[PDB]
Amino acid sequence: MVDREQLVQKARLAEQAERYDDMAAAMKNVTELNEPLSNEERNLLSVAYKNVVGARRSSWRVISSIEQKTSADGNEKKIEMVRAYREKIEKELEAVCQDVLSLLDNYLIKNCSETQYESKVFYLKMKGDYYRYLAEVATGEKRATVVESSEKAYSEAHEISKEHMQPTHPIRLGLALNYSVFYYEIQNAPEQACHLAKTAFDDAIAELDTLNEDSYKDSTLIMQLLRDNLTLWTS
């Protein structure tokens, strides 16, 4: 019988040791206590799964790159293991995404009140992200379904953030960042990606007086990331 405070302590310890699989597992155990998460427990869960899926996405990109070159090389003798190793990483990546998506759908989005608007946007942004990670590796009909699922999660998150959060709020800014990345990289819609990132940046600078003493550093950091992407995409 392990206490909730000890599990959060375990996640913090795993983060310092860079053992993100342990970190994700501890925060998954906290979620499964079937109680709402604090703002702190929410970010610990987010950081854990971002680093776990990040390592899988990086590995998949490396092996897929080698796979495209091996097929072009003409050596049929080597293609078998490259494809199988890419598939192995791909299934691991998908299982990480499905693991987070089950947590969001059966616990986090399912049981946060209609009043906890910050929590709702935070979880729907995560949902958009993990369906986007699934979209990156998916093909054909499987791809179209997860793309729609990602779009649906980002749009709902966007509507609640627009209505209940200031344009400078790091959750609203972070959402605009990832949703515009989804338009650019997944939907291949550079105009809509640039518009979304421009609107978010301009709405934040127009309401710069709404910057909070506890999160102004996070706000200015994401505003810069939005401007960075806007520069990259428009050049």
Added chain:
Amino acid sequence: MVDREQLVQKARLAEQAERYDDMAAAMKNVTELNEPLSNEERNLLSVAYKNVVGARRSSWRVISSIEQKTSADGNEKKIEMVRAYREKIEKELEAVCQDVLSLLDNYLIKNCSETQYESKVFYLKMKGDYYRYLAEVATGEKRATVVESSEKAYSEAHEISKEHMQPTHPIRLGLALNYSVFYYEIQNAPEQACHLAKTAFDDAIAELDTLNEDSYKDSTLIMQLLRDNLTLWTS
């Protein structure tokens, strides 16, 4: 006969080529046209002399360090050239400071109106800085005079900024940064240095609504530098 716009273009060209002596010389020529400087011409002058004096201060520190070791080494045969080379760098550093101080006293502070409060604080901060650079290399009675001169320039700048600028203004924040460094490093007053940097940071976060769309990045950068120094000095 060289135009003012061409001299500012020369300073910008010298900055890109990292030829700061050329940059300082071009901005010194602009000042000597005996007209007020634009906000742009002011920062170009400031950046030029900061890089020129910065290179001299770095060289003086290196040779002074070797000088202290050579005297401790007991080799009297080598002390002569080290001391003379340190003295050579030292005179160059002092002549750079006197060059900037003459520009401020006979042009910049001398001819900006009682209404141009931003200009006044900007020039008195520069004056405090260049007397502080002189204090670093000076000894005895010579040191006490330049320390007083630095203190007098920073205090006047502090009074005008407190009265006519928002606590988040980068000129007011930058002034608090350097004036607290003067207390810590020159006056060896850690308490007064920490108090000055704390007050400035706290006044800025208390009036975070006064952040300007054109300079919020500069404000948040100096606020962080203040917090950095406060952490270093209190640990």
Added chain:
Amino acid sequence: MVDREQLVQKARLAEQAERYDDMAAAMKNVTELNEPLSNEERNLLSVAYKNVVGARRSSWRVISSIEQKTSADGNEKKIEMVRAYREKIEKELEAVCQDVLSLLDNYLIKNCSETQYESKVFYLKMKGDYYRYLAEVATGEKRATVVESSEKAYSEAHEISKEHMQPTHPIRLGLALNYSVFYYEIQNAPEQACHLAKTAFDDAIAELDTLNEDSYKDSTLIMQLLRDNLTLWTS
């Protein structure tokens, strides 16, 4: 039924994806085919387990550091999970070491001929290393046994390398590097560590004519690492 060439391909693919656990597992499967390893398969096995044990050693150091501070902090409420998390990492580290040590004792050292002197030194250096990693985390009577085991493996490796390899050979140089680290860090014998590293470096420069066209870069790299450690330990 997976081919030996495909398993080596899997290890190379895992190395590019930085999935060292996969890499170690593939090379463990190659070893278990119960045939000698090529020079290439040997280094792939060595690199795999070095990165696997390296991550465990780094994690153990981080959590042990936090453990020493938490005990000193006086918060008895937090000591329980830190100790248990350190113990968890520690058991993982020990199981990695025992896994490699079983491979060396039941396959690699057990079945390489009396003639394959390069192979013998290579495997006995690995044995010295993995017992040294065990010594780092062990205490009391358990520590003394693994220290002796490490010493015994390094000494045998040292005798065969002295007799059958040139002083510039990267395996002989690499052995002198790790064996001197064992004296310094494990045995706390700075004199014997410095002597071993000095002798190896001096023997290599005295026979610089024995440098091989295929490994001169590896030789000069380890010679520098020996000189680096010698500088650090003698200052």
Added chain:
Amino acid sequence: MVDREQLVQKARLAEQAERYDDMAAAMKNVTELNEPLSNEERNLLSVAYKNVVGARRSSWRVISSIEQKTSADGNEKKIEMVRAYREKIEKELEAVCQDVLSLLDNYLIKNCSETQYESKVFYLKMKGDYYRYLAEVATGEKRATVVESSEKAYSEAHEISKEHMQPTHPIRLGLALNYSVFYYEIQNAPEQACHLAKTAFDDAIAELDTLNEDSYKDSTLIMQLLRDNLTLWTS
């Protein structure tokens, strides 16, 4: 009246302070004592002028780059100062080269004996280099003359090094490095550049037994630089 040992001490002090103009001036004063240079005084002179000309070459490249863009921009109002500032840097660069070339022709190459083969190759490599720096900024008939002058200096250096130095000697390796760069960048002869760098590298690995205890690190460093350039040029 300043002693030769004090001037070399001044050059070493200037090098630590990164005051390369002072360093070059001190070594120019040593050369002008009209006596041969030691191996140490030779490298101090070489390092001084390399850093002085290096800063001019870097500045010229930056301003020439801006000049090509300003002419393409169509703003005739700005072209005047860019061209004049480039010309100013260019004359400084040329005067540095002529300063070194006068030292080599009226002192160093002029008065080293027919027996000091290391000194002869060292000075003729420098001569090839400084005429190459002149070739980089020169155009038309002026360019053809300095290109021939560079070629003539490198070829003579190449003949003496081939006859009196081992293929692993850092002076012979360094010569092959710069002479092949001259073929690639100045003469636009990629085949001849690759052949020269390949021959030098292959001659060095074929005589790896000729590596000296006092300069093996310099030899292996330049051998790698040759292999680096060979990779870049053949891909």
